[model samples]
Target: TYQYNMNFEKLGKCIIINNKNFDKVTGMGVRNGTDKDAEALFKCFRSLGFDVIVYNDCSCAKMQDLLKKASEEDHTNAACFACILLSHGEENVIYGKDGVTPIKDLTAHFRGDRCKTLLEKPKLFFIQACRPVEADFLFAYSTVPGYYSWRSPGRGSWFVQALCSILEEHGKDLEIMQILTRVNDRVARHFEKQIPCVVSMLTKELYFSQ
Candidate 1:
């Protein structure tokens, strides 16, 4: 979960848990451009005044441990929380170096009642993977279900590039929906037959400080 703060004294931190490779036995395969994806997001978020931290390929247990540590921290003085998951995935699970893990395994800890410090604050998760069994959030999906998200072996993902472009131009000046719609429009207009999707439970506006 992530929150954007207008409180200058309590700027929030951004945690990126990047999982680019999976075990051979799992047959989940490797994600080649995800490191670059993480780097791009790191730069963008940092430019927005977030303290960004990146964790490279991690095991399921390690991923759990990292998220547990983050959720357990006192976010009382912080404005919000942000985490990005870059990995191979099925409907509701993301792959770790060791195996697949349920999205809730990480997100549950940040629930409104559990993480009181972040209660009523936005807890944003930017997951660049597959459409899950079920997801309910202010989320953006790069393509329709049962299809691959297009990426350049050199430039990275089309969806991600579009997303960053929109953020860079209007991240500080616009609301979350405005930013996401622009992202959606970029993909739909330029990606040939791409059909993007959005899900949400967002009740109010969200933003970044300039």
Candidate 2:
């Protein structure tokens, strides 16, 4: 009987910063089948009613600029913010087209202390590389700290696919934590090769519909 609003256009925009190819200099290996991953993310979020946009093959500076621009956008009317980053990751770093970049530099632009427009609203960062964590931010990572995530060429990554499915069916029906628990369960059951992590410091209950 309790269904939160599925109207995400009023909620916020979801930015997809995905990269399948790396510059020869980053020394990051090529991801042979990542376009499918990007496609899946685009369609899934669109179905959820969010204004979704995708950016591909960005260098370190470009990523910083993009998020900086995103931070400047008006989000006072939004329920939350989301970004899904896809690229090669390692040891605690992500490969931007330019080279290795600090995750903090990219995310710092959106911090509530910095980006006042998004103050108090939930900020979600769904990354394919290691991940990002900050205030008023919920980090939904595909694996535990220091573990690698797995993905099949055509099927999309394990985490994003499961997240999309769960959110689609229950986005309006459950709190964010409950939904993530389901995601943890699903990934554990089917994606035994990996582990997912959810870190939330949210101070109140949140739903897509209400």
Candidate 3:
């Protein structure tokens, strides 16, 4: 009874912003394996029943417009919404192809006051490269604040790889926190010095199984 409703007409929409390349003036290096991250995440979220969309190389203005429009759409038939951001980032900002933008600026579009249809519904944000909220929101970050998250040139990011692996095996059966804890274990066990973080204001337990 305390879990989020996952039995709506549609599970939800998942937006994957895969920013692999950056403008030279932005001083951000290319994210070599982000394509793989996007691929795996697309499959992973898709299998979990989300309508996933991937966006590549968006400018700051474009990023703002994208989520703003998404928020304005009708989610009345959907259970929740999710966004995954893969890019170069510092403590509190993520890089657009042109420059940087505050994480909050992008996410503000979905605040309960702005996106009424999503009010009280889970709004998930997963940051595979870097990285808020009112209740029912969860943020999964690849690394703790002010640290570097590891990515493999051949594979994808350590966090995303682990996340996909765990979700592949247990997505339909575990609680959201349980899934993320397993992902944390996988990353810490196999990689060096990096630890992922989850910030949750989720008012109910979340499960992918419908």
Candidate 4:
């Protein structure tokens, strides 16, 4: 069972970017795994009371524009912000129809120094991208620098499914950290050293509502 140590008010707004198609020049087929994961994630977050927006097969510039607009919105009245990226990824890069772009370039919009109104609010990012190394004691591997990751038809990748299950079970009452901890635990215990890692610098507890 999933449980947490904190309770929060309802959640605020969130945006989900699910990319299934890659540039033909890259020779990557559709990322059906990430697509499936995105659907599950969007539903889970919505169940937790977030207003979710989904952009499928977006260009790099489109992603940047979407987040920039969101960042400039009424963050002062928001409980927190959540963004999930389900796409083909490289070391520190995520893909777009045009090409690859730095993940930081997209996320930097929500930084405390940049989006001041959200200074103390949680800025959550659930990334289903591979980093630079294979899944080892150290880190998970990204797809070959210019190649695509493989996916199967039998089951979706472990991370997104585990995340959805955790949120479905505990999101209503859990703090962001607690829910994420459960997400980590479920992924780790199931995949055993193949867990999805979260990089966060949140300073306060956040909920969908407050």
In order of appearance, the predictions have TM-scores of 0.88, 0.88, 0.97, 0.80
| Whole-model Cα lDDT of every candidate shown, in order | 0.74, 0.76, 0.89, 0.66
Model 3 C-alpha lDDT versus the unseen true structure: 0.89
**Quick one: RMSD of model 3?**
1.3
Task: Score residue 186 of candidate 1 by CA lDDT.
Answer: 83
Q: Per-residue CA lDDT of candidate 2, range 44-142, in tens?
A: 777766789999998888888888899899887777788888887665566787787766677788887778878877787776774245656877777
Model 4 C-alpha lDDT per residue in residues 81-125, reported as the tens digit of each score: 778777777877888877877877887777677777665566676
In the range 29-97, model 1's lDDT, one tens digit per residue, is: 778888778888888888777778999888889889888888899988777777777787677677888
The alpha-carbon lDDT assigned to residue 135 of candidate 4 equals 14
Could you tell me which residue pairs clash in candidate 2?
4-209, 4-210, 5-209, 5-210, 11-79
Candidate 1: which stretches are off by over 4 Å? 1-5, 130-137, 143-146
Q: What digit string (tens of lDDT, one per residue) describes model 3 on residues 65-166?
A: 888999999999999999999898886788899998888888898998999999989999998655355878899999864787878797988899999989
Instruction: Tell me how far the alpha carbon of residue 3 in candidate 3 is from the true structure, in angstroms, after superposition.
Output: 0.7
Better of 1 and 4 by lDDT: 1
Residue 149 C-alpha lDDT in model 3:
84
- Estimate candidate 1's alpha-carbon lDDT, on a 0 to 1 scale: 0.74
In model 3, how many backbone clashes occur? 0
Best by TM-score: 3
lDDT of 1 at 67: 85
Show where candidate 4 strays beyond 4 Å. Answer: 1-10, 131-154, 207-210
Model 1 CA lDDT for position 49: 71
